Structure formats: structure tokens, C-alpha cells
Specification:
The structure is cut from a larger assembly and holds chains A (about 40 residues), B (about 100 residues), C (about 60 residues), D (about 60 residues) and E (about 90 residues). Chain B has about 100 residues and is mostly beta strands. Chain B has no helices and 10 strands. In chain B, strands 6-3-2-1-7-8 form a 6-stranded antiparallel sheet, with no helix packed on it. In chain B, a hairpin with an 8-residue loop joins strand 1 and strand 2. Chain C has 1 helix and 4 strands, in the order ββββα. In chain C, strand 1 and strand 2 form a beta hairpin. In chain C, the strands form 2 sheets. Chain C has a two-stranded antiparallel sheet. Chain C has one domain. Chain C is mainly beta and about 60 residues long. The longest helix of chain D has 23 residues. In chain D, helix 2 runs antiparallel to helix 3. Chain D is elongated, with a radius of gyration of 13 Å. In chain E, the strands form 2 sheets. In chain E, strands 1-2-6-3 form a 4-stranded antiparallel sheet, with helices on one face. Chain E contains 2 helices and 6 strands. Chain E is elongated, with a radius of gyration of 15 Å. Chains in contact: D-E. At the D-E interface, helix 2 of D face strand 1 of E. Bound molecules: magnesium ion (MG) (36 copies). Chain B binds 3 RNA strands through strand 4, strand 5, strand 6, strand 8 and strand 9. Chain B: Belongs to the universal ribosomal protein uL24 family. Chain B: Keywords: Ribonucleoprotein, Ribosomal protein, RNA-binding, rRNA-binding. Chain B: InterPro entries: KOW, Rib_uL2_dom2, Ribosomal_uL24, Ribosomal_uL24_C, Ribosomal_uL24_CS, Ribosomal_uL24_KOW, Translation_prot_SH3-like_sf.
Chain lengths: ~40, ~100, ~60, ~60, ~90
RNA sequence: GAGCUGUACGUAAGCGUUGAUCCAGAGAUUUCCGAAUGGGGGAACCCACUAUCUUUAGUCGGAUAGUAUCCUUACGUGAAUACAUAGCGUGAGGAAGGCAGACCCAGGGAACUGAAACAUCUAAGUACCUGGAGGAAGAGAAAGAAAAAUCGAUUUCCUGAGUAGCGGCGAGCGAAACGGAAAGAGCCCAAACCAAGAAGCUUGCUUCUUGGGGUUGUAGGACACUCUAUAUGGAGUUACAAAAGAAAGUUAUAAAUGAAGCGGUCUGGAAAGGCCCGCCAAAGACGGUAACAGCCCGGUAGUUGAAAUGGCUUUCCCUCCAGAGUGGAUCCUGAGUACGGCGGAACACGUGAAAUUCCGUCGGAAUCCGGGAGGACCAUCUCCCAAGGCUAAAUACUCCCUAGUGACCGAUAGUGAACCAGUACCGUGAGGGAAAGGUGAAAAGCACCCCGGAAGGGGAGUGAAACAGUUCCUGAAACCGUGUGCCU
RNA sequence: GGUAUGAGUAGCGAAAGAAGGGUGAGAAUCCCUUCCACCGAAUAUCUAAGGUUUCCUGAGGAAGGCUCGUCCGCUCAGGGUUAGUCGGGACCUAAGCCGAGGCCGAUAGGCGUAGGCGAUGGACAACAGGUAGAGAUUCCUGUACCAGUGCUAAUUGUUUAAC
RNA sequence: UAGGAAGAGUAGUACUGCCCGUACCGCAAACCGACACAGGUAGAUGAGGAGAGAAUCCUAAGGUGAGCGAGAGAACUCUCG
């Protein structure tokens, strides 16, 4: 039994866009990933 | 460009220098120009839809415009070109 | 959490040992919850003991 | 364009309808592989656009 | 409008095989409800619609030399016209 | 002004001198997500209500608009509670979020490290977080600097000076004024008092509102007195009050015109090169063109140019405006302030002999005969007038734009990234993060034949070259082979 | 970064195959047949998660497949997923999360009331046949059910109270 | 029950019923394990004989012969008698 046990919902609830937007530090992450020009935030 | 399709030009550089002809096409994006009977290439053509028998076709390939001078239809000489405004539209003039 | 009159509030500085070790601390205002009329309407607000001294009305 | 400006709003509205129907039938023929002049499509699209533009300029 | 709701007919071995069962297959707007399709088809073809079945096709992943991407998501409607209705042509 | 329908080494249908494609200004359209704001949500989805149309025989459908929260404000309604007030509703404004990791101000604020250990100290008020944000910010018109018997707001640069100083007097930290420059600009309140109200009983006196007045040092103002202005003049949206518009000029955002060699020969695949002749030059910039071009092309110097939009500068309009002198009877001149104790911090200055400045806490002046500073403090002298506000320029930085420059790089360099790179890939995630440029002048990109299922090859042909053959300039070394002169 | 050496070496990942016929340039390895052998509380049949086109058909055999390959979960084209009743939403709430006002707090924020969201639970109406290259309680035939809507017809209310 | 109320039910008849998912794999070569990896992966069903049994052995339905082979039958190693 390996460390990554996938779940569509858990993925989005922990790491998803709305969760990132729900906190100041999550918004910092989005700002940082935009500044670096990532294709994919969240 | 200083020449357009239908103009008679002299060729002034290359293997066909001294030969004159009628500009058949102009490719202004590439500053290239197709002259009748100039820069003839041998295209090794597979049979297809157009040219169904195929064959080694002798046809014209484009020359860089800077290698043709406009033939003044008056004196039949190569010339540089000016621009003069004649009432309505501007027209090319010779030297 | 600040005096509504004077703006007094927490500010930081050093605690110092006899040996001059420094460690961060605050000074808090001597804020008191009191009923005063802010915009005519009386309500409970933080006011500094200093601001209540003499002037101001509860 | 100048010809469109001649027409009344209501008349342009009816000219649009016709063009919308035309565009629909072109796309239909195209999907059934019964359309040769495929350049017609873009013209009609542009036309519709032109007509909406004039109507919006009226107001 | 109704001709924005119906995009184009769907001409495949499957879609053609049910043109005799009075079942016509269309590509419709991806936001269009099957009710919007039922009234759209009635406004364009002057038919009487019995039922409209609809399915969402997600885009298919296609590579063309290093560059990979998705074809468009589609909404496909199968419109069954009543037994007394006129037929659509194709 | 003749071609055009982006790339990219396709087919098709078309468009264009009745002016296309293309270039610049203005406008229109601008799905959904996102502060996201009708409610919800696992971003790019789901589900409504209220009007007003619309469709159907009616459900079922469609279109348009409105509907978040808080703050301020007006108007309504309105509990316990009688008046009220909270609360609730509606209408106006406003905010929200983002970011140029820069610069700036503020709140909060490390540690490694140095001190050859380490605790005071250093690193360092740095990194970082958070807030405010502005094109700059901050500072700023003396309760200043000084000690000539004098300076006149602030800021930045040079200098003073590694000085004076601070410092387990260790490591280290380290000024300022004077002098020299850049740039310069000054102003408005609070209060006496005056007028007109409202609110109060202080009941004819006080306390709030709006206007006038008024701004400074042995003084200024109020206040009396007089002299001239009541826009004659003056000033202005960069402070000094604040909205407005016009016009002309200019700059930017597209462009136009623009001299002179097809010169003769040589080599060559090709001449811009050699040799020999000319010419233009306010143009011998740069680039391209089959090798190196002032005279071939795009251009270049010079000279013209703008319908539209924006910027700037003048001028007009428009708006706004009182200044001198003479008297110090009386009045006013920033109060929980200044100062002080205690605890901290900032000052180069580590509590010291510690002035000066700020924070928390407590105590707490004088208030014109008054007050502050000159590095404990007192006296004298000198200079200054705090506890209110505003203020351009010289300064800092560069996500950007335009024009350029380089004894800067040239594909392992230079950006991580010359190439569809923050991509692929790795990671649950934050985050980490590559490799990879060159056919030819032109595709002229190898018809045709031959072996082969193809791949691949050999001919033929194109080309200057194909040992330039679609990852194709050059093509080193390792390494892998075939052949053979000498040896074994 | 390239290329050696080790080296034609270790390894080629649990397992039963055989022949005949076919296909094809080519066959231990693809297709068919027959026999044989293996699993059978599974090595069968469903379904959820997760994956996301791998599914079907035709063509292909560079690379991938530890060999081969005519084959393939690979490459290239075209296709393919049908619901009032199945599962989810237009219903419900649990833990938990958010949270108007509010309370607390250098900033940032933390907490929390009303109110929301949130299944792993509650509620909730469809069955049997057929059909097939690729879906099927979804398509078709038959027979139903749930919720609505009008339209005809009587029936009964039409301000003392049917509903 | 508080409230609201002239339309309500009954019968027949014919219409109306949205969005999302639906392919395929799913004890696996398609999921988690870098692999076409002896591992891991919740739930429903899970036949017969002998049997208490879902044990065991052999079988049914159904599924499969497992992506290197041909020989050889030394040492040695492993797994077995
Ligand atoms: Mg993973
Ligand atoms: Mg469906
Ligand atoms: Mg919304
Ligand atoms: Mg040391
Ligand atoms: Mg010229
Ligand atoms: Mg020659
Ligand atoms: Mg050369
Ligand atoms: Mg050159
Ligand atoms: Mg003092
Ligand atoms: Mg002290
Ligand atoms: Mg200090
Ligand atoms: Mg003193
Ligand atoms: Mg004190
Ligand atoms: Mg002194
Ligand atoms: Mg001193
Ligand atoms: Mg004073
Ligand atoms: Mg590089
Ligand atoms: Mg190189
Ligand atoms: Mg090469
Ligand atoms: Mg060996
Ligand atoms: Mg061996
Ligand atoms: Mg072996
Ligand atoms: Mg195996
Ligand atoms: Mg068993
Ligand atoms: Mg398959
Ligand atoms: Mg192989
Ligand atoms: Mg195959
Ligand atoms: Mg049915
Ligand atoms: Mg709860
Ligand atoms: Mg609750
Ligand atoms: Mg819910
Ligand atoms: Mg199936
Ligand atoms: Mg299925
Ligand atoms: Mg496995
Ligand atoms: Mg288990
Ligand atoms: Mg069997």
C-alpha cells in the first residue's frame, strides 16, 4: 500500500483553486505561481 | 516593390544577366519576382492530379527584385524609378 | 483593541535582564470598556484611562 | 454597408433572419458534403455581423 | 435563436442507419437543453418531435508532432419525430 | 496602391484598381471563470427569485433587466418602553481585488555569522510577514544652526572624516555643523474680536453651527484711530479657493518624397571582389541582394505630411481676491499638552555626566511680567515661539514604451528559456525544472530505371557542391571496423 | 555530453501445450479447428473508487512489447456513451467546514450566532422481452408507475365558510 | 389548528417531465506500486460430489495456457521425493 491513494474530491478539496483562494496564504501561492507563469495553478 | 506583375524588366545580376522579360508573378513578402524565360529550373515531378503523366518539367523560378530594373517603354533601356502625383493617382517616372 | 479617543494601543519593545539580554515584549494601553456617546449614540468602547482623566463623559 | 444603412431597423432585422437561415443551410449542406462553394459561408457570417453592427450604431 | 441551438447534422454509418426509424442526429450547442432542442427542431424543419435523447461527448486527445491537445467537446441530440410528422431530408 | 485568404517545406473554395490584404486613430461586439457581487460550488459549474415581454391548449420552454456584503449619508418605518433609541426597509455615493520580488512610508521582526568560544555587542532594524500606498514617497518654512558680532524651510551630492565620539573602550559601530554645489517657494488654520442664527434657561446670559477677521517674537494680531484700494490692479486649479471650457501652436501615434554606374574587362555557380574608367554626397547609417555595394533594392541626409485620438505650451474665457501706517489700557496667541518619575526605544551616542526625539504608564506647568533651546544643571547672554495643517523642484527605483550604445555573450556561452519553456518531466502539495539553433542563392527537395514487402541502397537527373538529400554548414577526439608494409 | 570495459556475459518477471489448416514478403509467437492442460469463495459474473478513450471498425509495423510479430492496451484515420423511474443535482440532514451582525486580537487574522454548505446515511415512480461492430432498466416492442398540465363531462361550493 | 379562500376534487381523454454521469478496464497489462512489476485495491453474486464448511480434492457455468524458445539431462545452487 503506497503513499498516493487518489481521490478526485480530496485532491480538489485540499489543493484546488477554491481552497487556495479561501486563505491569504493560498492566494500567495496563486500569486507566486502566476508570477512564475505556471500553466497550471491549483 | 519597384516592379509589379505585367512590367517588362531587364535582369542585371545572375546567370541570366542581359535577358529581359514580362513579370508573371510578384511575391512581395519574400522580395522575389517571377520573370518569363528567366531562372528556368528542372522540377522532377511525380505523376499526380496535375501533370498526370509526370515528367522533368522545365519552368521559371523567382529572382530577387533587386536583380531586375524596369524597362522604360520609351527608350527600351533599364532605369531607376521616381514617383510623380498626376491629379488623381501617383505614377512611376524614369530617369 | 485601541483607545477610540487617542488611538493608544499595544506597542513593542525590549524586556532587559540585569545582564542586558533583550527579549521582545509589548506595552499595552490602559484601556477600559466604557459607555460613551461616539456619534450621539452611546455604546461600549475601549477608552484609555489617560483619555478618561478629567475630560470625557461616561 | 452603405446599402444596409438605407434600410430601416425592422427591415435589417428581417435581412438578418434570412442570412441566419442561409448560414444554417450552408452549414447543413457542408456537413452532408453537398456544398461546393464553401467560401459562401464566411461571406454570410460577415454579412450578419455587418447588419448587427449597423443596428447597434442606430442606438 | 434556434439555428444557434442546432449546429449541423451528424452523418455517420450509425446516424444514417436510424434515418428510416424517423430518428435524426444533430450536433447542438453544448449549453442547449433537450427542451430547447425539441422547440429548435420544430422551428427549423416544421416537424412534430416525439422525444429528444441527448449525450455529451468529451473532447478526444490528438497529437500532431510534439503538439498534443483536445478536439472540441460535443453535444449530440437524437430527435425522434412522431409517426404522422413530415421527414427531415439529409 | 497590387496583390491577398497568419505560421509551416497542404488540398479546396474564393476576394481584389467599384481599392482588397496590409498600417495608424476612433468606435462596436467582447461567451464563461476570476474581487466575482442573486444563492451555492470541487474556478471556468449547478440552481434561483422579482419584474416585463415572448412561446404553447396549458404545463414544459425562451429574451431582457434587477437582485452580494460593509461604510458613509438622506428618507421612511420602528422593540423591550411612554417619548425615544436599537433594529428593519428603500434611495444615493464609496470600498472590496490585483500588482514592478523595484523604489517609498508604517506595524511586526529573525538566525546563521563576526567577536577566532560566548552571553553585552555584531549580523541588523537586514531577510521575511503585514498594512499604506505614490509616481515618487518621506522631509519641509525654525520654540533651527550657531557663537561672525551671523545664518535664514526641506531634500540630495562633494567635503568635514574614518575625525568627534560610542564600544565586554573588545569585535566593531560611527555623526553633525561650518564650507562647496544641484534645486529653490512659500503658505493656510486654532484663538481674541465682529455679524447673523439655532439650542438652552446660565431666564437676557452662556454653550454649539455657518460666515467675516486673523496668523506672529524685546513680537504679531484682535482692538481702537487714520490712509488708499472694493477689481484700478493681482492671482489661480502643483501648495497658497475651486470647477469649467474654447482657440491657435507644437509633439506623439500611419506615412510621402528622396542624388549618383544595367560602366568596361578578369576570375567565378553567382561579383557587391581584382584591374581600369566615371559619378552623387546636408545622403560613405544599417540591412538585403547568388562572395565584400555611397551610385541594384529597402532605405539614409535633407525636405514635406495627419481625418482621428491623446499629451504639452501659450493666449483667451471662466473663477477668486483688500493693503499700508500709528498707538501695547485691556484681550488672544494650540492643556491632560509641555515637562517630570518609572519601563523601553530612537538619536553614531550600549544609562552614561546624557542634552535632544518617540512609545506605554502614572504625575502634571506657565500660559505674556509668558514660554523653549544653546549636550547634566544654575546664572547671564544669544537665538528661537512647541503642543494644528499644506507645499513643487533638486533625490530613489524601472514591470513598461521610443530611439540608440557597448575594447558585453555567441548555442555547455548569453536569460531557466535563440527552438510553441516555466513547456516536458518530477512531486500529494508548496515547489523543483531540462534537453533541443545552421539543406541550398533558389526546392531546383532526387522524374525514370534497378534490387527490396518496406527501410535502405545503386544508377539516372537537379545543383557550384548531394561525401549539401527534409534534423541535411563545418565535422575534432574517444570508440567501432575493413585492407595491408614490418614484427609475433 | 559522447563512447568504451565488463560481454554476446547476467537477465528475459511464478504457469502446458500439440498438430493440422489458414493468412502473409516473412509465422514456436496472428486467425481457425481439434485434442490436451489450468482456475472454479476464482484466475468466473457484477458494482464502487481510480484511470480517462485504453472501447469499436479499417489500415500499419519505424519506435513501444524484455524474443518474434502478419498481432496489440502501440501508430494513423474514422466512429462509439441515448434515461421522468438507474446513480448524483433541481430534496434532507451527520461529522466537519463556512459564517451577516457579533466577541477577541500589533497587522495578518482567531473564534462564533442566525443562516448555509457538506454523504459514507434518510427520502424518492419500470419491468420483461428484442436488437447489436461499439450503449442499453437509457434505443425498439409490449405492459406499467410517479409528478404535473390543459381539454371535455357531469358533481358540488361560489362570504359564513366546499376546499 | 393559526391563517388563506372560489374554485375544488372525481371520471375520462391527450399532452408535459430539465441538468450531470452512462464508452472501456476495474483483485487489473487500463487503478496505487518509475515497468505489460509474484505486492496492494471497498462491496454484491459465488454451482456439484464427498463434506460441518466459502476447508479440501476433482469438476460445472464461465474464464485461462501468462509476450522468449529448441536441446541437454555435468559440477553447483534452489525447490522437491
Ligand atoms: Mg503519482
Ligand atoms: Mg443523459
Ligand atoms: Mg454568482
Ligand atoms: Mg570564530
Ligand atoms: Mg535611390
Ligand atoms: Mg563569368
Ligand atoms: Mg559563399
Ligand atoms: Mg553576404
Ligand atoms: Mg527640555
Ligand atoms: Mg527614560
Ligand atoms: Mg541604540
Ligand atoms: Mg535643557
Ligand atoms: Mg513619561
Ligand atoms: Mg552649554
Ligand atoms: Mg556632545
Ligand atoms: Mg507660539
Ligand atoms: Mg543555454
Ligand atoms: Mg557549435
Ligand atoms: Mg553535417
Ligand atoms: Mg564472465
Ligand atoms: Mg555462464
Ligand atoms: Mg542463461
Ligand atoms: Mg514471462
Ligand atoms: Mg478454496
Ligand atoms: Mg481494442
Ligand atoms: Mg521486437
Ligand atoms: Mg494490427
Ligand atoms: Mg421508456
Ligand atoms: Mg453542525
Ligand atoms: Mg446550523
Ligand atoms: Mg446539499
Ligand atoms: Mg459493452
Ligand atoms: Mg458499461
Ligand atoms: Mg500485477
Ligand atoms: Mg483488504
Ligand atoms: Mg468449460
Amino acid at each position: 500500500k503506497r503513499t498516493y491513494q487518489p481521490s478526485k474530491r480530496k485532491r480538489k478539496k485540499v489543493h484546488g483553486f477554491r481552497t487556495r483562494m479561501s486563505t491569504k496564504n493560498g492566494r500567495r501561492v496563486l500569486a507566486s505561481r502566476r508570477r512564475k507563469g505556471r500553466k497550471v495553478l491549483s | 516593390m519597384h516592379v509589379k506583375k505585367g512590367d517588362k524588366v531587364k535582369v542585371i545580376t545572375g546567370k541570366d544577366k542581359g535577358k529581359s522579360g514580362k513579370v508573371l508573378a510578384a511575391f512581395p513578402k519574400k522580395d522575389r519576382v517571377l520573370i518569363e524565360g528567366i531562372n528556368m529550373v528542372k522540377k522532377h515531378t511525380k505523376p499526380s492530379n496535375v501533370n498526370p503523366q509526370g515528367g522533368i518539367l522545365n519552368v521559371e523560378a523567382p529572382i530577387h527584385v533587386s536583380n531586375v530594373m524596369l524597362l522604360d517603354p520609351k527608350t527600351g533601356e533599364p532605369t531607376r524609378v521616381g514617383y510623380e502625383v498626376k491629379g488623381d493617382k501617383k505614377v512611376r517616372v524614369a530617369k | 483593541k485601541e483607545c477610540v479617543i487617542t488611538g493608544r494601543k499595544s506597542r513593542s519593545g525590549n524586556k532587559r535582564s540585569h545582564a542586558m539580554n533583550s527579549s521582545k515584549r509589548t506595552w499595552k494601553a490602559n484601556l477600559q470598556k466604557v459607555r460613551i456617546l461616539v456619534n450621539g449614540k452611546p455604546k461600549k468602547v475601549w477608552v484609555s484611562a489617560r483619555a478618561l482623566k478629567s475630560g470625557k463623559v461616561e | 454597408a452603405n446599402d444596409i444603412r438605407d434600410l430601416s431597423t425592422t427591415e435589417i432585422q428581417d435581412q438578418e433572419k434570412a442570412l441566419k437561415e442561409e448560414l444554417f443551410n450552408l452549414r447543413f449542406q457542408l456537413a452532408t458534403g453537398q456544398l461546393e462553394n464553401t467560401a459562401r459561408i464566411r461571406e454570410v457570417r460577415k454579412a450578419i455581423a455587418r447588419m448587427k453592427t449597423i443596428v447597434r450604431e442606430r442606438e | 435563436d434556434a439555428r444557434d441551438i442546432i449546429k449541423r447534422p451528424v452523418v455517420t454509418e450509425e446516424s444514417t442507419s436510424i434515418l428510416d426509424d424517423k430518428k435524426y442526429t444533430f450536433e447542438v450547442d453544448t449549453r442547449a437543453t433537450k427542451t430547447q432542442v425539441k422547440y429548435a427542431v420544430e422551428e427549423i424543419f416544421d416537424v412534430k418531435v416525439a422525444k429528444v435523447n441527448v449525450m455529451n461527448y468529451k473532447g478526444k486527445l490528438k497529437r500532431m508532432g510534439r503538439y498534443a491537445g483536445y478536439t472540441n467537446k460535443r453535444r449530440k441530440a437524437i430527435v425522434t419525430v412522431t409517426a404522422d410528422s413530415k421527414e427531415i431530408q439529409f
